[PDB]
Every structure is written in structure tokens, then in C-alpha cells.
């Protein structure tokens, strides 16, 4: 649950790590958002896309309202099976 979580890393640095030529499409990491407090961000790779992971006041997370999760790990497991709206399916955890 920690592997793909890079925490407080900048958007610029997440793009720099994801854009490594060794990383296949679908390489990703989850991080804290720099513009929206309380929310996270899923960065996936070749270009990088950034998705805001919003948090409901009751608890859960979601990128789009039609697909909600109890946690970041439930969100990651879901998009690792189907991109379902994302640019690509989550395939690889970004190397440190």
C-alpha cells in the first residue's frame, strides 16, 4: 500500500521519474496534491497524465463520481484491472 505512494513529491518530479525510458506505459505513482489540499493525485505515463483523487467528507475516494473507493489501495487495485476512463491501465509501480 506504500510502494506506489510517493507522498509529498512535486508534480515536476513525479513526471521526471515516470518519464524514465525504462518505464512502460501505465507506470504510475500516487502522491499528495500541491494545488488542492486533502486530495491526492494519480500520475500515470511517452507522456504523463495527472488525475486528482478527490476525497468525500464521509470518507471515500474517487477520480470520477461514477467510480468510488474506500481507499487509495482499492482505487489502485481497480485501475490495475481496467483503465475505465484513464489514459491507460495501471501496469507498473514507478521505481524509487
Amino acid at each position: 500500500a506504500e510502494e506506489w505512494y510517493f507522498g509529498k513529491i512535486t508534480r515536476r518530479e513525479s513526471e521526471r521519474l515516470l518519464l524514465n525510458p525504462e518505464n512502460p506505459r501505465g507506470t504510475f505513482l500516487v502522491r499528495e496534491s500541491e494545488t488542492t489540499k486533502g486530495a491526492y493525485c494519480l500520475s500515470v505515463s511517452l507522456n504523463v497524465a495527472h488525475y486528482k483523487i478527490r476525497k468525500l467528507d464521509s470518507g471515500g475516494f474517487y477520480i470520477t463520481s461514477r467510480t468510488q473507493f474506500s481507499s487509495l489501495q482499492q482505487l489502485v487495485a481497480y485501475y490495475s484491472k481496467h483503465a475505465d476512463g484513464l489514459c491507460h491501465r495501471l501496469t507498473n509501480v514507478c521505481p524509487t
Binding site: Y51, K52, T64, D84, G85
Partner: peptide
């Protein structure tokens, strides 16, 4: 600049 949105 911005973020990608899952299409509606």
C-alpha cells in the same frame, strides 16, 4: 498546468 479528467 492542469489535470486530465476521466470522460463523462
Amino acid at each position: 498546468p492542469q489535470y486530465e479528467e476521466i470522460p463523462i
